[PDB]
Ligand binder design. Sequence first.
Ligand SMILES: Nc1ncnc2c1ncn2[C@@H]1O[C@H](COP(=O)(O)O)[C@@H](O)[C@H]1O
Ligand SMILES: O=C(O)c1ccccc1O
Ligand SMILES: O=C(O)c1ccccc1O
Ligand SMILES: O=C(O)c1ccccc1O
Ligand SMILES: O=C(O)c1ccccc1O
Ligand SMILES: [Mg+2]
Ligand SMILES: [Mg+2]
Ligand SMILES: [Zn+2]
Ligand SMILES: [Zn+2]
Lengths: 432, 430
Amino acid sequence: AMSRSRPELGDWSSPAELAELQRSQLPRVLAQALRSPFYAARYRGTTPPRTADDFAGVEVTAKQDLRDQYPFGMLAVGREHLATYHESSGTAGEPTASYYTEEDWTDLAERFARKWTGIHPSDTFLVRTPYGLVITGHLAQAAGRLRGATVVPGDARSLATPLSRMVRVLKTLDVTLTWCNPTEITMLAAAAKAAGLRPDQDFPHLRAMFTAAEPLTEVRRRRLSEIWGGIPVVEEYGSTETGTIAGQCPEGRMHLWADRAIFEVYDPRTGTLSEAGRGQMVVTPLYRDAMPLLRYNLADDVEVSTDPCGCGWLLPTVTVLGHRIGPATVTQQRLEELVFSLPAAYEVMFWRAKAHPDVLELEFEAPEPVRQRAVKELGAALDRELGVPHRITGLAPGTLVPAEALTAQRDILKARYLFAEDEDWDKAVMYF
Amino acid sequence: SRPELGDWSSPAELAELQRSQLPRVLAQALRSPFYAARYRGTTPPRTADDFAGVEVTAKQDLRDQYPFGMLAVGREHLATYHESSGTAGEPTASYYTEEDWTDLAERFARKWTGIHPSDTFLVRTPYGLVITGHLAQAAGRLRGATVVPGDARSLATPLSRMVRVLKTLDVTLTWCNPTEITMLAAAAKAAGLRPDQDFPHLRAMFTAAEPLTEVRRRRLSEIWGGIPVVEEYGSTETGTIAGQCPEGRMHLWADRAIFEVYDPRTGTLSEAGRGQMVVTPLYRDAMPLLRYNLADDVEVSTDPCGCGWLLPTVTVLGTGHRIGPATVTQQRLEELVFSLPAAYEVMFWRAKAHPDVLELEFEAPEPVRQRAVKELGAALDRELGVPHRITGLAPGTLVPAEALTAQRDILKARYLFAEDEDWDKAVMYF
Ligand SMILES: Nc1ncnc2c1ncn2[C@@H]1O[C@H](COP(=O)(O)O)[C@@H](O)[C@H]1O
Ligand SMILES: O=C(O)c1ccccc1O
Ligand SMILES: O=C(O)c1ccccc1O
Ligand SMILES: O=C(O)c1ccccc1O
Ligand SMILES: O=C(O)c1ccccc1O
Ligand SMILES: [Mg+2]
Ligand SMILES: [Mg+2]
Ligand SMILES: [Zn+2]
Ligand SMILES: [Zn+2]
């Protein structure tokens, strides 16, 4: 590496060489970790870990530790070196703070930019995740700028950017790439149809859709691809606290970015850490100064395999998993496979289910002509695959996902205090 | 590379710094479909002298050329794409190269209070398509300040959460519109924090996007413990084109753009006086603008300022209503509302011009309400002489308690729920 310090795919040719690329960083990482109040307090009366060998003995860092240290208990650098500050999704009541130096950001941007489809100057990249405190909009934008793509900041959950306006942007700007959660991929598809555009034909420049943030079955991922004309739906896995830790290969598996972090699986029964198997995703990022994390337990239920993939990347794969009803165990993943196995022509995208002690209640939207078939087929799928008692109800479109979410436009107004006689002064101080 | 405050020592040297860029700027402008079509079949302007004759560019031209009619570079050289606030029905597209962004970031970073690594900077403006959030964030990154991306109009970041962030992160700088400054002050009290005492690290508040009287600006400062409220002037299409000096005048960033005043009656352009703000940015390659008429009503003065910056000053107006004998502007009413004593806590108000009467409502606590109505009535009598119907309202009437106190979990879509959970958050989870 003449110019770059941080590793790339191909700097190692064996699992043995990957482990050495990792362990060589641990002295710096362990020295940096001890600079934070949290780790200096953890190792108070003892000898701190310093060497790659000492790492074996290092205690897990829990989500609750990150919350107890709010806001800067995990901080290992002077505040003058921070570039951005972030907070996690979930509960507003117990915030999880994350923060990054400029150089931390180069590692974050590189990991997001590991998109098998590429990101190029030729791309127009719609970033359709929130920019409010969470990292996700900032992360995609930073990766877009790193690779020279035109970034369209769509934001998400903003009154400035309803779906109708995103559909017009996708079409008229010839957008080539999107970043949004998998539910937003279906929201955009429904908004396109309500504008009289066919997601499968009317966006010929759209070449890939980047997604994360929800457990996503291959059956649902394939349907989302088919809705949008058979283009790749490129999954990644991360968190505000870690950045992107795994990205899809051309074969459709997520591979751990183990050159940039030590990945371990925590068995909460035994409290053992292992390089692979089923249990809780544990991460030690190797290229971060501001907020060192030693064996941070994301508490996501994962399966990590060192088994080779068809792609040939020399990295482990990860599946992210994320209610029992009499004899059967019913998961969202299993129901999602059954819902998204209904024929595409039935247009079933929006659904929800509740586990009662004795019965699974499930609702979905479908057009009237196909609704009774969709109810019957999905019932028979549940009988055949799970054998749970069910109450399935088909609903009119606009019942779960209202028409106004899909078609309403909103002016981006500023506060006004003086109105003409014929104006609505309801928009005076509450103008959003 | 690009000029800094102090690189010119006279108005004559400033004009030379400008005119020297015009050949490049005029050549770049002609690369766009719009300007190539405008000067089709004629000889195009090429020299600093030719600039005098150049036709104004209207906001309607930017709308008519949606999306990339104003584009002077290959799309491969674009860094970001933006759209303006106002009507959703007629989008105004703008776009910038990486080098365009350095000029934008430098102009925003011209804050007389500075932006430093020692700063923690809450950006509380939208990131959704408009430039505003992205502009403040790029300036914070340029100057090394810790950027806290608050966003605005996002379900992710309600006022209650911004107030907790202001306090617990020791935020030193904010960027938000002047109404948001009062919204945050009301939200702070609802969270049990006194804006005038409980934010000791807050040192300055940056604001723009509303016509702002000195009387209102001073009150916003007093609400937040007497710290500077630093106004700038800009637009979603240009970024910051003027910034406040320590004397409280906004100075035009004329080293980065030629500023002219348009008389719409005659279509005469002038270096100073009354009329419509016209801007020709000098360091803007993706989307060249020749004499872009912002259509803001402004007064430009070349008079020297005590601050010692050798740049013209600008006052920004906004067009008001006849009510019997008198003409009432928002700015005039705002001066009267914000001349009520601070202890009355009149911040939220609205008014309607009828042909015969000014209807005005504001929130004030019950003990002060009748005095506030009487004093404000006498101010209107004394200053405007318009008939008025003034009503005092309970706090929570114009700005509801919910907007100030509601917390909102940042949920993701969920499809399987337990019996006792709210499944209304399944697909509509915002
Ligand atoms: N591709 C994915 N599949 C499943 N869950 C995901 C995926 N990406 C992100 N997540 C979830 O989202 C979390 C990130 O949370 P946050 O930092 O609050 O945005 C992860 O810890 C997972 O629980
Ligand atoms: O909410 C989202 O849209 C989202 C998308 C990707 C990653 C994290 C997120 O919160
Ligand atoms: O869920 C997230 O916040 C997230 C953040 C970074 C990258 C991928 C992700 O899903
Ligand atoms: O909407 C805002 O809060 C705002 C603030 C500053 C400048 C432009 C803006 O729209
Ligand atoms: O919209 C504004 O009034 C504004 C002001 C300064 C900078 C960016 C902006 O959009
Ligand atoms: Mg580019
Ligand atoms: Mg810094
Ligand atoms: Zn693979
Ligand atoms: Zn001055």
